[PDB]
Scaffold this active site. Structure first.
Site, mmCIF file in Angstrom:
data_model
loop_
_atom_site.group_PDB
_atom_site.id
_atom_site.type_symbol
_atom_site.label_atom_id
_atom_site.label_comp_id
_atom_site.label_asym_id
_atom_site.label_seq_id
_atom_site.Cartn_x
_atom_site.Cartn_y
_atom_site.Cartn_z
ATOM 1 N N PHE A 89 0.811 -1.215 0.000
ATOM 2 C CA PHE A 89 0.000 0.000 0.000
ATOM 3 C C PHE A 89 0.847 1.268 0.000
ATOM 4 C CE2 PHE A 89 0.887 1.321 4.291
ATOM 5 C CZ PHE A 89 1.303 0.154 4.893
ATOM 6 N N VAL A 110 3.861 3.150 6.677
ATOM 7 C CA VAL A 110 3.409 3.838 7.883
ATOM 8 C C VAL A 110 4.634 4.425 8.565
ATOM 9 C CG1 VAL A 110 2.274 3.649 10.148
ATOM 10 C CG2 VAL A 110 1.407 2.360 8.146
ATOM 11 N N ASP A 130 -8.444 -9.587 6.310
ATOM 12 C CA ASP A 130 -6.982 -9.700 6.327
ATOM 13 C C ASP A 130 -6.461 -9.730 7.760
ATOM 14 O OD1 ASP A 130 -4.405 -10.043 5.344
ATOM 15 O OD2 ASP A 130 -4.169 -7.974 4.696
HETATM 16 C C1 LIG Z 1 0.728 -4.711 8.874
HETATM 17 C C2 LIG Z 1 0.258 -3.286 9.015
HETATM 18 C C3 LIG Z 1 1.325 -2.436 9.446
HETATM 19 C C4 LIG Z 1 1.991 -1.675 8.535
HETATM 20 C C5 LIG Z 1 3.015 -0.862 8.919
HETATM 21 C C6 LIG Z 1 3.365 -0.840 10.244
HETATM 22 F F1 LIG Z 1 4.332 -0.077 10.653
HETATM 23 C C7 LIG Z 1 2.659 -1.601 11.150
HETATM 24 C C8 LIG Z 1 1.657 -2.426 10.763
HETATM 25 N N1 LIG Z 1 -0.630 -2.811 7.924
HETATM 26 N N2 LIG Z 1 -0.694 -3.625 6.826
HETATM 27 N N3 LIG Z 1 -1.586 -3.093 5.946
HETATM 28 C C9 LIG Z 1 -2.074 -1.990 6.436
HETATM 29 C C10 LIG Z 1 -2.972 -1.072 5.987
HETATM 30 N N4 LIG Z 1 -3.272 -0.038 6.726
HETATM 31 C C11 LIG Z 1 -2.737 0.210 7.905
HETATM 32 C C12 LIG Z 1 -3.124 1.317 8.599
HETATM 33 C C13 LIG Z 1 -2.577 1.616 9.809
HETATM 34 C C14 LIG Z 1 -1.667 0.755 10.392
HETATM 35 C C15 LIG Z 1 -1.058 1.171 11.644
HETATM 36 C C16 LIG Z 1 -1.708 1.978 12.519
HETATM 37 C C17 LIG Z 1 -1.096 2.412 13.662
HETATM 38 C C18 LIG Z 1 0.183 2.081 13.914
HETATM 39 O O1 LIG Z 1 0.898 2.392 14.928
HETATM 40 C C19 LIG Z 1 2.087 1.831 14.705
HETATM 41 N N5 LIG Z 1 2.070 1.148 13.574
HETATM 42 C C20 LIG Z 1 0.901 1.253 12.994
HETATM 43 C C21 LIG Z 1 0.273 0.839 11.852
HETATM 44 C C22 LIG Z 1 -1.241 -0.373 9.733
HETATM 45 C C23 LIG Z 1 -1.741 -0.693 8.496
HETATM 46 C C24 LIG Z 1 -1.408 -1.787 7.735
#
Ligand SMILES: C[C@@H](c1ccc(F)cc1)n1nnc2cnc3ccc(-c4ccc5ocnc5c4)cc3c21
Length: 327
Positions: free
Chosen positions: A18, A21, A134
């Site tokens: 995507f 983050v 997911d």
């Molecule tokens: C596996 C996960 C993720 C991606 C990056 C990350 F640093 C941690 C988790 N992830 N995989 N696909 C997606 C799509 N949207 C998101 C939106 C927000 C977050 C998220 C939100 C708060 C967080 O606080 C710390 N890491 C975060 C990741 C992760 C996601 C996300």
């Protein structure tokens, strides 16, 4: 880089298809850091991000205090053509924690509260006509990842123990409403339900299958489906859970996986001996016969029911005896 004139990037937390983050300092507001999802400027991921924003806006209206432990979106905006979603900053994912612990499993009491919060969160989605699609340990994040590093005599290694096992669920970009178009293929492979693999159609129960896979991984420290091939994945299921139901087999169009309406699998091929060594009947994975291990594995077995119409619902899962020491 400083998005929206206020958010200075200080770290990249994680990257995926995507986008990424990042962790940001908020230079306008008081100084608690935030998480910012920066989405690729690709239609595919833009559209998912807008769907995520719509879902999170409706969940914020219904559950503004995150009683049901979905991650909180603080705001969103566009910047150089990228959609950026600001989230409360969470700690490590449950996967990151296991990995950083050397793949030591979580303690049973922590599994109990994490599973409860996960089921609570996803049941809230299901209550709202949504399927996550997911669920995986990477999308379950600790509110705080602080730990104490204790000497564990059994056996002779320092181990990290969670101070607080509270979690939140993240990633609503694949979430799908009951009446919306359903993608052909959902979930990450090791968490993917059989009705998805066999292209029979899926609904809320496919989330329950993924949670079942998550729980075994928390218990073992490793996945029971170490595979990157669909037919082998089905062979692993049959090794762990028994044969696939015949009604599901004759409904699928995935005829390449089957011979005479049974899985086309040679247990004495090289891949067959790999499966036999990596997988075994579900209850043979239990490390204790104690009653609370028994109830966890009863819950897992109900979540890993092949027939999505017979699989336990999360409303029913939440009343399972495994969760009693929580109440
Ligand atoms: C596996 C996960 C993720 C991606 C990056 C990350 F640093 C941690 C988790 N992830 N995989 N696909 C997606 C799509 N949207 C998101 C939106 C927000 C977050 C998220 C939100 C708060 C967080 O606080 C710390 N890491 C975060 C990741 C992760 C996601 C996300």
């Amino acid at each position: 880089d400083v998005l929206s004139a206020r958010y200075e990037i200080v770290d990249t937390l994680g990257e995926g298809a995507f986008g990424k983050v990042v962790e940001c300092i908020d230079h306008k507001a008081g100084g608690r850091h935030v998480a910012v999802k920066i989405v690729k400027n690709v239609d595919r991921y833009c559209e998912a991000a807008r769907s995520e924003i719509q879902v999170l806006e409706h969940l914020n209206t219904t559950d503004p205090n995150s009683t049901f432990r979905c991650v909180q979106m603080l705001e969103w905006f566009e910047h150089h053509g990228h959609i950026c979603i600001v989230f409360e900053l969470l700690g490590l994912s449950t996967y990151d924690f296991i990995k950083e612990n050397g793949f030591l499993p979580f303690r049973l009491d922590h599994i109990r509260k994490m599973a409860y919060q996960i089921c609570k969160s996803v049941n809230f989605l299901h209550s709202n006509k949504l399927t996550h699609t997911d669920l995986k340990p990477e999308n379950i994040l600790f509110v705080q990842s602080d730990y104490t590093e204790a000497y564990n005599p059994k056996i002779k290694r320092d181990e990290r123990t969670l101070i607080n096992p509270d979690i939140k669920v993240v990633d609503f970009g694949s979430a799908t409403y009951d009446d919306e178009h359903h993608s052909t293929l959902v979930s990450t492979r090791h968490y993917r339900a059989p009705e998805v693999i066999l292209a029979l159609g899926w609904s809320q129960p496919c989330d329950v299958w993924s949670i079942g896979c998550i729980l075994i991984e928390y218990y073992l420290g490793f996945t029971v489906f170490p595979t990157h091939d669909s037919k082998e994945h089905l062979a692993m299921m049959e090794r762990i859970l028994g044969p696939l139901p015949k009604h599901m087999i004759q409904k699928t169009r995935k005829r390449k996986y089957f011979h005479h309406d049974r899985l086309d699998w040679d247990e004495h091929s090289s891949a067959g001996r790999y499966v036999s060594r990596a997988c075994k009947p579900l209850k043979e994975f239990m490390l204790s016969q104690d009653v609370e291990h028994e109830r966890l594995f009863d819950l897992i077995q109900k979540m890993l029911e092949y027939d999505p119409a017979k699989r336990i619902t999360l409303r029913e899962a939440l009343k399972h005896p495994f969760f009693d020491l929580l109440k």
